């Protein structure tokens, strides 16, 4: 099953990464930043530019050659919209364990076709597209999030919004909780990883003691996450979950920046999402500025901030 690849979401200091679109503008810049962060960036692909070096690293014509020659276990895609679905499919065909697609603007129909192939295999896990990537603070950064605001810690964060991820990260670093693993699932309607996929990993990760789930209008992923949490996050070991759902003030029938953020035919409003998550035991913050303080207070009431003297 495709769910077997959920484990590949949890990047760490031993993850080895190649860059598809390596010689492009953003591929170059974020590969340089990845090296400076300490990510094991080992090479990349641009079709037709194999046999060159770039940033002191090898460039390959194909994902298969790059993977075989470097032992890469993850790929990050900075390929323009007309070709990014093909880049994802090439990485699936090469059985790369984790593929992270940053690109915004892939045709929705392209992603429906990609997801059809993705769901019929279990070797490759896709995050994205239209996402900032994934980060294990101090261990591995694959994406475009600002490194300096993170702090290794206790909160797992999953979000349909990159910018709101940064808000939750900054808030949780400020109050000293830090982050165990942050996954941006992206703003597109059809993507490789949903909330439930990350919740499975967070609930079974001892390092993740609390969870922030950030959603927005459109689709049904938040409702599916609520159902997952009803079944799997009840009991004495239940972990605190705090959430913000953007778009209570959004008008209907309009895509609000993200391709997936629309109230369409009456479906996808924020109010129903907040209700579903509250019924699953999630504490929903009234304000997007109070994610960190809200989960802090949940920890406080559970005596999870006591000092060992």
């Amino acid at each position: 099953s495709y769910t077997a690849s959920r484990k590949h979401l949890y990047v760490d200091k031993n993850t080895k990464v190649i860059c598809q679109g390596f010689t492009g503008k953003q591929g170059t810049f974020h590969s340089q930043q990845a090296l400076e962060y300490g990510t094991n960036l080992v090479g990349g692909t641009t079709p037709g530019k194999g046999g060159k070096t770039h940033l002191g690293l090898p460039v390959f014509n194909t994902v298969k050659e790059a993977k075989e020659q470097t032992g890469a276990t993850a790929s990050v895609i900075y390929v323009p919209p007309p070709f990014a679905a093909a880049a994802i499919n090439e990485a699936i065909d090469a059985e790369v364990p984790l593929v992270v697609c940053i690109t915004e603007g892939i045709p929705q129909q392209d992603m429906v076709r990609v997801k059809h192939r993705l769901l019929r295999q279990g070797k490759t896990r896709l995050i994205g597209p239209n996402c900032p990537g994934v980060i294990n603070p101090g261990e591995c950064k694959i994406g475009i999030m600002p490194g300096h605001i993170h702090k290794k810690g206790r909160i797992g964060i999953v979000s349909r919004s990159g910018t709101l991820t940064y808000e939750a990260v900054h808030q949780t670093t400020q109050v000293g909780l830090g982050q165990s693993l942050c996954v941006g699932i992206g703003g597109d309607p059809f993507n490789g990883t949903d909330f439930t996929d990350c919740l499975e990993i967070f609930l079974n990760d001892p390092a993740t003691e609390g969870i922030i789930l950030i959603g927005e209008i459109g689709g049904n992923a938040e409702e599916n996450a609520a159902e997952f949490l009803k079944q799997h996050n009840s009991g004495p070991k239940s972990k605190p979950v705090v959430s913000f759902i953007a778009g209570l003030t959004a008008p209907p029938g309009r895509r609000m920046g993200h391709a997936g953020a629309i109230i369409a035919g009456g479906k996808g409003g924020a109010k129903e999402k907040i209700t579903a998550l509250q019924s699953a035991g999630v504490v929903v913050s009234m304000s997007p500025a109070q994610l960190g303080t809200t989960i802090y207070k949940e920890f406080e009431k559970r005596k999870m901030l006591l000092v060992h003297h």
Binding site: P189, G219, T249, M256
Partner: protein, 393 residues
């Protein structure tokens, strides 16, 4: 993007979908000739505007009603003379109305059965879905609320394509019978293939129905398009009719800016869709009314920052501007450069509240400082919203 009725119906007709026979005319004489060419028993003349309420509208010529039926081609020409070049006002237009440059001259068909049929990519199942109801002629939301048992779905596998059995079952559940059911099943297949060909996000036919004479027809339809596929749908996007858009939204589109006008006076200028929605939300929570949504996009360039800021400052509804950037791929200095240059070239007549975080924030803040512009710096989202709301009457 938006298509006029004649544009969507031509697109459907060119792909085998049955619509009423019609011609489009841009002069009264062309309307006359089109009406003769139809060789129809009854003719409908319809002014082409996007807003609803045409039937009860009024033209600046004095003519009442944007939809007229007649059996006489000369009457079509005469009434078209009182439509073309004039403004049509309706309940859904501004007081001035909308200029009518084209009319549709169509065969008027009676409706004996009305059903609802839409095709879209299912947000809960991977792949296309047919959504149908025998209860046609009303918003799908109404049917879902009153008679959810009358909503039927067929999940389609994108690789296998639509199967005859799926089309036939949906046609049966819509209530079509015998040969009309076979016609409707065939039309469902044509609609499905159209949906994929044009990168629609939705093809909605309502009413999808039949005439008393025994033909299945798509009497009216609304097509929504995937903006992400513009690069491979150039001909369709060239038909985009922007005449009824907010003019600021049209200016924003010229610079590939994702701007949505709202009813408020606090402008928002943000680098992410989620944060932009959240910024509107938190302005409201602190007692304000956002004037717009704006997601600059991760790939924003300085020129787009410049243009976006000018659009906000030029909008008479705006009484203050909230800039809120948490940069990752977006470098905060590009924001500072675009804003300061845009204000070097005009006076800043509204309060400016700025919250910057993330990539290269210190350089960006020094750019803002050394520009001399009057800025209220905010310490976080809540502070930014409170200061913005405090900056307006």
């Amino acid at each position: 993007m938006n298509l006029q009725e004649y544009q969507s119906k031509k697109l459907m007709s060119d792909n085998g979908v049955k619509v009423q026979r019609f011609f489009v005319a841009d002069t009264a004489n062309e309307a006359l000739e089109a009406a003769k060419r139809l060789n129809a028993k009854e003719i409908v003349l319809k002014a082409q505007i996007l807003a609803g309420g045409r039937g009860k509208g009024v033209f600046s010529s004095g003519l009442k009603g944007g939809v007229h039926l007649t059996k006489d081609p000369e009457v079509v020409g005469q009434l078209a003379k009182q439509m073309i070049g004039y403004n049509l006002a309706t309940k859904q237009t501004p007081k001035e109305g909308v200029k009518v440059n084209k009319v549709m001259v169509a065969e008027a068909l009676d409706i004996s059965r009305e059903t609802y049929l839409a095709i879209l990519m299912d947000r809960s199942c991977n792949g296309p879905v047919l959504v149908g109801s025998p209860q046609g002629g009303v918003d799908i939301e109404e049917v879902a609320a009153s008679n959810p048992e009358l909503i039927f779905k067929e999940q389609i596998d994108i690789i296998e394509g639509i199967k005859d059995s799926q089309a036939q079952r949906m046609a049966e559940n819509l209530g079509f019978l015998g040969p009309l059911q076979n016609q409707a099943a065939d039309q469902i297949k044509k609609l499905y293939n159209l949906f994929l060909k044009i990168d629609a996000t939705q093809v909605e036919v309502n009413p999808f129905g039949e005439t008393p004479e025994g033909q299945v027809v798509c009497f009216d339809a609304k097509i929504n398009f995937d903006d992400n596929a513009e690069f491979r749908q150039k001909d369709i996007f060239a038909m985009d009719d922007k005449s009824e858009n907010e003019p600021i939204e049209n200016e924003a589109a010229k610079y590939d800016l994702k701007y949505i006008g709202l009813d408020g006076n606090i402008a928002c200028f943000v680098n992410g869709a989620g944060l932009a929605m959240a910024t509107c939300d938190i302005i409201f929570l602190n007692g304000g009314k956002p004037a717009n949504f704006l997601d600059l996009g991760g790939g924003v360039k300085e020129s787009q920052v410049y243009q976006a800021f000018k659009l906000l400052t030029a909008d008479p509804k705006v009484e203050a501007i909230l800039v809120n950037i948490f940069g990752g791929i977006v470098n905060c200095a590009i924001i500072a450069n675009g804003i300061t240059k845009a204000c070097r070239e005009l006076e800043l007549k509204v309060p400016l509240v700025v919250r910057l975080e993330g990539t290269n924030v210190h350089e960006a803040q020094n750019i803002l400082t050394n520009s001399g512009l009057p800025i209220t710096s905010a310490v976080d989202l809540e502070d930014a919203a409170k200061k913005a709301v405090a900056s307006v009457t």
